[PDB]
Design a protein around this ligand. Structure first.
Ligand SMILES: Cc1ncc(COP(=O)(O)O)c(CN)c1O
Ligand SMILES: Cc1ncc(COP(=O)(O)O)c(CN)c1O
Ligand SMILES: Cc1ncc(COP(=O)(O)O)c(CN)c1O
Ligand SMILES: Cc1ncc(COP(=O)(O)O)c(CN)c1O
Lengths: 425, 425, 425, 425
């Protein structure tokens, strides 16, 4: 029952392919606190990878889950239905941006959600190709690995992933890719490899997660929407990570000024329970013939009641406003730290989807991956759990539960401050 | 709060692609009993589609789940580990057949397990192709739909699924496909479309589920194993449905006299909680580099403890012996009904994976899909939940919990018997 | 000079990937005779691989070529047209079977012809998949290698060829594949891997060439034509080898009682000059937008006049009739030899597309690849050029020019007769 | 017998997909002169699309062709060899750039050459993927259409072409793509879609043909070579159009300062006869096992002696030097015309591979496709045959025979001048 001991057993029974960011075995948790098997307490700034916007075991969520456990945990919706699945669908049809009739499909994981959105876009348009962006992340199934703009390590050593997935450039001025370059990269696909008539959908993260927490501007998103409309291409917004309130609105697309045809959600939607889904223009969703959509565990009963509670908690605890306030506080603190450390070349984020990006001597073409990894390690040593990301591994992101305590905001920022001070020594 | 009312709401909020076998909304359940929103009771012979071998809400399983709910529900193993994931892996490494050391990856859905078994086989052999069988069912992601030997409705209207998946014939003498034809169909692939050096794996269900409950014979499975050994090809046993004790042994491969290189499992492994996995040769599992395997919800903590308890219950309540006793009582009972109804052309099954196949006037060339569906509808009217399957929709399968009580076995057979009799006028 | 000296230079300047059936360098040839650089004379029973139905350098063909050579050899039709191309197309439109308007595309090689026929079927049906048959041979480009039903050596060591080509079984009672098995295999594809709505074409050789000189029966071709009509699938007859008179009619489909949608031709169409083409249902051919069809050397002027001259020669010289007479004499002569040599298990062929298949001890399950190779070697030492074929390399085919004299037919059979006698001594 | 009547017959016998740049039917030609069926004479600045660098029917080439026509026209090299094939291979092994042992394969068309070079590279590296550049042109087979950086019209309406072909950006400063952008676009592929370990080759035209006569700089080519060397990727130089002396040297790579691993050649290699081939590092070429390379008409006897004669003519008549002189006279004359017409935004070219690009009011952002088309039509009315190209159809290219007479160069330039003036009036 020591972390080391458990890691030894892990090497024996579990594949090295399953990475381990922190060699620690968590035992119990509560809101933003996690205790490992040795009793040490940590402040969780990773949030189970953006899955815990309402924190570990939110009391209301757990209470709803415990009540559902008295009724049933599974029937397989496609065989025998149940109300929690229906209710969530009804609520998502209203909450997802788009001033038009929508329908919702529930599945189990974010990769399944993206898979289903594409199968739906293909059926609706009678086309087979898709376009995804550089640095994108959409899942670990063969097809979402192809959609994912990163081979190593997600699909490394496995041979080539499915074809007919084309690569566009994600707008990112910080790294010299203008919105014009991004829109131009799409037309390039049209002229060089796949005409519009063969593209069923363009998949994009309103705010890239693993890609580096880079956000699309409303203007860029508006150009994209116009491009899709012109060519009858479905716009799929993958909000698995940006969704469930992380950016200050339930869905980031609300802040773009345009609505997508399809939206994928997961992670924080059920606050720590396995659930995912796709909500979209009704006519598009209905394109698949009966029997064409499913999944054994899809819209698991317990996960659904959990999601329903999460939605009510956002409303009751005013978490969207808190997300925004937390974001301002984190960025202000991060900018203060930045004044003493030029390596921090950018502080950014919508709502609580905050990140800082490190550069050697603030040199924007020199991603500082060693410092980023060093800060993560030093933070773990000070009891703070962090995650990094970015195609060059030089981005630190903050995904702490929105339910965080005032004291914990100070605590996390203080610990980060120390890490940069002690790394520079 | 009426089934019809909820069905109307379903039709407006959920896409038609999500099918519905029984237009009923379950409210609560216990072991083999299910109650709908109207208070009507049903005997569940579908088991959430082979997910409830230990019954709805087995008390031991629920108690384990409730204890974990007091600790944590999610951290994302790849970020912070936890003991329930590690303990289940160790047990699965022991329980899945094979005299070599195994390693286990836990994910969430059956589709993901198959996806990962193939990725792992590709990384291990450094090959990209795979072979799957006619009538096979492996999931609803783009790649598993390609593996699935059934286009309609699973991938209907969507265009061609991922290439480089070759089709072999599942052995099935009842319908003229000999074991020699089956093996010859694999050599044909080697000769005509993809040499052995390009085939990473051959995926097979030891007992096809959706395909019609057709079982491979040990002899066949041994020829398959030998063919794979000869070519360095990974044998992937998809036991998502056949697994977790349905055939009288924990895994069907135990009755085949050979061990596969990789085994996928899900559905009944956690008795009603979202979990799936892949267990196989340790050096094959480790072929994928760190960071190449995962998934946000993978090995969800609550589902892991649920699974550990399910395995304990199989042992304490002697469910494997019960599966075999249940299977015999069911087959004896159906063979009885078959005496008065020639349409019942075959009664079969390993352990409790039982099925009957209907033919118009016992003519094996005339699948009776109409009678099949009628029996399903009549049974529901009598309070019995059934599922059919098979490429010709003329197979009735029984997936009732292995924890069913003796009187319920009689009750169910009695209802089935009544359905056939009444179907005669 | 010396054949061996040239072979030595060959090994140093040319990749070993280019096979050499006969280690002999030809210097001159005429009709059915070939003389090597050592002055040795050979009776050519291979016909440049079915390219010389009108014999080496037919005087009429040569005179037409010389006349054209004084005018121009190339302009690239797509840039500046020329009459010989136009004229050939008009004649092929009327001569290729099909009681409906047709258009003809001229390219250069047989592989290009097949490539374009599939491209045209895809544009006409707006579908991307194709079906080809076991043991088929369609060319050496990436896509035709996928269509080709034989991986080694055509595409050995190169990794997997293009996907979305599905495999059906070619009817062959001799080796246990009935017509019902063949058609069932097509429906199997529709059920398991690609719905009819995703198949642009079914490609078939009315008489397989490399596959072993196995011919389709009119009854089978008719079931196949009806299956295509029912699903809107284009039937492509690849007559690159069976065409230009080899079977007794200009095209083998003529003897099938049904017409294909598209026909590819090459080899013998130009009597020894580079030319290939696609003739088919006009509205299908016109489905491709201008600029979509071409090739720099396409419908080479010199090869076009040679082809026009070849058609006239078939008429003026009664070659179709002669092909039938030649085929009968060859089969009668081969059957006489078969009375003394049990290894000859089958003597078959339409028109002059004649082959015999060798089996060890006359057992249809024991192909005798060694004996076949031995006969080719012995025949060569006796001044007779032969080619073998078949997936088991135990089929000897006869592709001698249709212009052969009676004495040479007798002579060819005697030589063959002696090779069998001396192979058994 | 008028161009009009022949164009009408054409509309009825030939598919519309076969485009027709000039609605004229040629009857005969000599060097750079062409006469149509109406007896009108034209000055050919298109060279049969870069195929006639030694002019129409060069008397030395014709005499070589006539000598061979008396011996044999076809045997199928892979069946029975002949010396003309072997001798050209030996010469190309020496002529193709690269200070190391090489081997040569002869096929028939440029697309078949690219096809085989890729197959060879895949076999040599044991990798399945390839990278090609934007605006590239490599042929009309399925795979070369995927390699081709232009969907319309080459593969328009045919569905998606073969996957696993990735797109890099060709360096073109005139349009804003720096060499750094080009090289970075390759690393982007490695990072986002296909690791170097899965890329067998990078295919590039030293000077893009259809692409717009845009040439790679030695610096860029050297960077590409260093990149390929680092990753074990084969650099395939497609010189089908740039080769056979068009750029001032036999092969353009000679001017790049580095040698490709494989080179494709066709068009002008045989002065108007169907031939093409691939020459490469011996060890790379030998990677394919015997029987893996071929083609019925491959290295046709008559085209081989024509290519041999073409190479002698280049040496004897110093056509490489003339290419350079012609190039200079063309640019000087075109530059002169550019002063009176600002629409000519660029005059460029290595050797005799000359082009000018038209912009709407010198605005490089406004490709003048309409003026380009007008000039072609006016030139034709004036007796001069020209061809345009470029992704935006605003590039006029000159592929006039290198054997052109001085007065004709002036004649041609004068006509182009009048076209621009009159188009402006
Ligand atoms: C944008 C995005 N899309 C899809 C997924 C896949 O979700 P899951 O891991 O739940 O399958 C993730 C998870 N990291 C994600 O961030
Ligand atoms: C053999 C088999 N494989 C894979 C799957 C897919 O599992 P899931 O629905 O959990 O994704 C199923 C589900 N019916 C199955 O029976
Ligand atoms: C039926 C068939 N189709 C296509 C081809 C390819 O023709 P080519 O070699 O002229 O490219 C051949 C050549 N053996 C053939 O026999
Ligand atoms: C660079 C290049 N590569 C390949 C080809 C194809 O050659 P072919 O038309 O002879 O098949 C062309 C033809 N314009 C070409 O320009």
């Amino acid at each position: 029952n020591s972390n080391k001991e458990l890691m030894q057993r892990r090497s024996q029974a579990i594949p090295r392919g399953v990475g381990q960011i922190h060699p620690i075995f968590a035992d119990r948790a509560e809101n933003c606190r996690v205790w490992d098997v040795e009793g040490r307490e940590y402040l969780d700034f990773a949030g189970g990878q953006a899955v815990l916007n309402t924190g570990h075991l939110h009391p209301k969520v757990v209470a709803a889950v415990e009540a559902q456990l008295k009724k049933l945990s599974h029937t397989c919706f496609q065989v025998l239905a149940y109300e929690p699945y229906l209710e969530l669908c009804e609520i998502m049809n209203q909450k997802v941006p788009g001033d038009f009739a929508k329908k919702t499909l529930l599945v189990t994981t974010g990769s399944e959600a993206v898979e289903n959105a594409v199968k739906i876009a293909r059926a609706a348009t009678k086309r087979s190709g898709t376009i995804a962006f550089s640095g994108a992340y959409h899942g670990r199934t063969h097809y979402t690995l192809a959609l994912t703009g990163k081979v190593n390590p997600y699909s490394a050593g496995m041979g080539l992933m499915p074809g007919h997935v084309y690569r566009a450039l994600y707008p990112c001025p910080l790294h010299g890719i203008s919105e014009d370059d991004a829109i131009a990269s799409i037309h390039r696909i049209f002229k060089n490899d796949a005409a519009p008539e063969d593209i069923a959908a363009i998949v994009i993260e309103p705010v890239q997660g693993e890609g580096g927490f880079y956000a699309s501007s409303p203007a860029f998103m508006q150009r994209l929407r116009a491009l899709c409309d012109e060519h009858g291409i479905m716009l799929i917004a993958d909000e698995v990570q940006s969704g469930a309130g992380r950016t200050g609105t339930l869905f980031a697309m609300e802040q773009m000024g345009v609505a997508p045809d399809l939206t994928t959600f997961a992670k924080s939607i059920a606050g720590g329970f396995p659930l995912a889904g796709v909500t979209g223009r009704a006519e598009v969703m209905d394109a698949v013939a009966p029997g064409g959509l499913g999944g054994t565990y899809a819209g698991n009963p317990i996960a659904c009641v959990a999601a329903l509670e999460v939605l009510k908690v956002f409303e009751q605890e005013n978490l969207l406003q808190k997300a925004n306030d937390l974001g301002q506080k984190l960025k202000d603190g991060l900018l203060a730290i930045a004044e003493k450390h030029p390596e921090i070349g950018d502080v950014r984020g919508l709502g609580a989807m905050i990140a800082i990006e490190l550069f050697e001597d603030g040199d924007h073409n020199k991603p500082d991956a060693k410092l980023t990894a060093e800060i993560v390690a030093r933070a773990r040593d000070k009891g703070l759990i962090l995650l990094s990301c970015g195609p060059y591994y030089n981005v630190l992101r903050i995904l702490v539960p929105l339910t965080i305590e005032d004291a914990q905001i100070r605590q996390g920022l203080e610990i980060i401050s120390q890490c940069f001070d002690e790394a520079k020594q």
